[PDB]
Design an enzyme around this catalytic site. Structure first.
Site, PDB file in Angstrom:
ATOM      1  N   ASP A  96       0.913  -1.138  -0.063  1.00  0.00           N
ATOM      2  CA  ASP A  96       0.227  -0.145  -0.017  1.00  0.00           C
ATOM      3  C   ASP A  96       0.848   1.282   0.036  1.00  0.00           C
ATOM      4  O   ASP A  96       1.315   1.529   1.191  1.00  0.00           O
ATOM      5  CB  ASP A  96      -0.992  -0.067   1.132  1.00  0.00           C
ATOM      6  CG  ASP A  96      -1.871   1.095   1.352  1.00  0.00           C
ATOM      7  OD1 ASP A  96      -2.030   1.679   0.357  1.00  0.00           O
ATOM      8  OD2 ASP A  96      -2.509   1.157   2.310  1.00  0.00           O
TER       9      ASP A  96
ATOM     10  N   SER B  49      -0.298  15.431 -12.123  1.00  0.00           N
ATOM     11  CA  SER B  49      -0.635  15.104 -13.348  1.00  0.00           C
ATOM     12  C   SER B  49      -0.780  16.353 -14.331  1.00  0.00           C
ATOM     13  O   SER B  49      -1.392  17.480 -13.673  1.00  0.00           O
ATOM     14  CB  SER B  49      -1.894  14.186 -13.634  1.00  0.00           C
ATOM     15  OG  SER B  49      -2.039  13.727 -15.088  1.00  0.00           O
TER      16      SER B  49
HETATM   17  C1  LIG Z   1      -7.656   3.779   1.585  1.00  0.00           C
HETATM   18  C2  LIG Z   1      -7.519   2.584   0.635  1.00  0.00           C
HETATM   19  N1  LIG Z   1      -5.966   2.022   0.987  1.00  0.00           N
HETATM   20  C3  LIG Z   1      -5.849   1.452   2.296  1.00  0.00           C
HETATM   21  C4  LIG Z   1      -7.027   0.563   2.882  1.00  0.00           C
HETATM   22  O1  LIG Z   1      -7.022  -0.714   1.948  1.00  0.00           O
HETATM   23  C5  LIG Z   1      -7.781  -1.693   2.189  1.00  0.00           C
HETATM   24  C6  LIG Z   1      -7.331  -2.999   1.492  1.00  0.00           C
HETATM   25  C7  LIG Z   1      -8.094  -3.996   1.489  1.00  0.00           C
HETATM   26  C8  LIG Z   1      -9.390  -3.751   2.226  1.00  0.00           C
HETATM   27  O2  LIG Z   1     -10.091  -5.108   2.358  1.00  0.00           O
HETATM   28  C9  LIG Z   1     -11.306  -4.908   1.981  1.00  0.00           C
HETATM   29  C10 LIG Z   1     -11.221  -4.719   0.329  1.00  0.00           C
HETATM   30  C11 LIG Z   1     -10.332  -5.184  -0.572  1.00  0.00           C
HETATM   31  C12 LIG Z   1     -10.317  -4.792  -1.866  1.00  0.00           C
HETATM   32  C13 LIG Z   1     -11.370  -4.030  -2.453  1.00  0.00           C
HETATM   33  C14 LIG Z   1     -12.159  -3.192  -1.591  1.00  0.00           C
HETATM   34  C15 LIG Z   1     -12.198  -3.679  -0.174  1.00  0.00           C
HETATM   35  C16 LIG Z   1      -9.851  -2.478   2.635  1.00  0.00           C
HETATM   36  C17 LIG Z   1      -8.997  -1.506   2.558  1.00  0.00           C
END
Ligand SMILES: CCNCCOc1ccc(OCc2ccccc2)cc1
EC number: 3.4.23.22
Length: 330
Positions: free
Chosen positions: A35, A199
């Site tokens: 991430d 961008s």
């Molecule tokens: C702010 C964004 N990035 C940080 C949080 O990242 C996440 C990763 C996985 C998750 O698990 C559930 C899920 C997985 C796939 C797509 C949709 C939701 C939640 C949050």
């Protein structure tokens, strides 16, 4: 040193990507979501509330001869999507693709939100934004990249995400075979702790390029491309029957549509997102309404170049003294 690991979509839509990570001695391999929009390395563990674990692989620090409790340290994170997790902290040996960091902070979850529990394929997150966002208290901890940086052949990592296919995260080197043409580098602001860049504009399909500054973050941990409402409306206006649905929570389109491409600018260069990358499939099983991969950022407070955008490019996260981002076509 260098490392190289394969990253694999968790499902048929590329909703997220997982990369195997070795933790502890002997190694415990967990599949983490790398991430670039957060800075905590946290895992499902033997400490996680039992009712909140449903098929994930857990880290058990008591079985690692190199694990040390980081006394008094806690962590708690709330993500832009509304998900959250919290717990305590160990230091342990962490390896990715052959690259090893000793003494890495491994944040052990005691609690996770329902979205984490309900996704059996993600065993935790490995944050690759700047360490200023790390949530460990009272002593903030460094990311895996920040701890590895000085040891790497070059202070870089690269994201090469696949469309409906595996891809690669490399640490410490740029694989000149993995992209076409040249890499265009662009300035980064670290002021919000993100890989934040500007961008130079966009085009919809075969349309003319609109020169306009769009500030946003390169975020491998966000699925979709979130852009200003003006840009998103211009895109979906080219798709017959597309509409913003308040009930579904974004733009939807007829599943029968053929979507136009979307181009974004990186300096004078252009990255083209094929239309198929923007299809996230039926809103519910068997629906003929499909969810769009380009959505408004209006309700977020930042534009997000998530996986939809990044998977169209070879992306260099340059952690030199002045960080920069690089984008190439591939
Ligand atoms: C702010 C964004 N990035 C940080 C949080 O990242 C996440 C990763 C996985 C998750 O698990 C559930 C899920 C997985 C796939 C797509 C949709 C939701 C939640 C949050």
């Amino acid at each position: 040193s260098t490392g190289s690991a394969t990253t694999t979509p968790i499902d048929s839509l590329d909703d997220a990507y997982i990369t195997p990570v070795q933790i502890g001695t002997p190694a415990q391999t967990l599949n983490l979501d790398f991430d670039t929009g957060s800075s905590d390395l946290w895992v499902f563990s033997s400490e996680t509330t039992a009712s909140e674990v449903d098929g994930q692989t857990i880290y058990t620090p008591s079985k690692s001869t190199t694990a040390k409790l980081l006394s008094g340290a806690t962590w708690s994170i709330s993500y832009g999507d509304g998900s959250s997790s919290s717990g305590d902290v160990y230091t342990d040996t962490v390896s990715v693709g052959g690259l090893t960091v000793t003494g890495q902070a491994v944040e052990s979850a005691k609690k996770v939100s329902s979205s984490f529990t309900e996704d059996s394929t993600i065993d935790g997150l490995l944050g690759l934004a700047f360490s200023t966002l790390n949530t460990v208290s009272p002593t903030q901890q460094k990311t895996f990249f920040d701890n590895a940086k000085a040891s790497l052949d070059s202070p870089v990592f690269t994201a090469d995400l696949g469309y409906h296919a595996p891809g690669t995260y490399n640490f410490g080197f740029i694989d000149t075979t993995a992209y076409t043409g040249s890499i265009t580098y662009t300035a980064v602001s670290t002021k919000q702790g993100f890989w934040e860049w500007t961008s130079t504009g966009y085009a919809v399909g075969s349309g003319t390029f609109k020169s306009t500054s769009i500030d946003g973050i390169a975020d491998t941990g966000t699925t979709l491309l979130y852009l200003p409402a003006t840009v998103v409306s211009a895109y979906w206006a080219q798709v017959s029957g597309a509409k913003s649905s308040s009930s579904v929570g974004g733009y939807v389109f007829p599943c029968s549509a053929t979507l136009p491409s979307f181009t974004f600018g990186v300096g004078s260069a252009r990255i083209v997102i094929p239309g198929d990358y923007i299809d996230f499939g039926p809103i519910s099983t068997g629906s003929s309404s499909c969810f769009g991969g380009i959505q408004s950022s209006a309700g977020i407070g930042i534009n997000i170049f998530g996986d939809v955008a990044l998977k169209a490019a070879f992306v260099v996260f340059n952690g030199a003294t002045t960080p920069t981002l690089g984008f190439a076509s591939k």
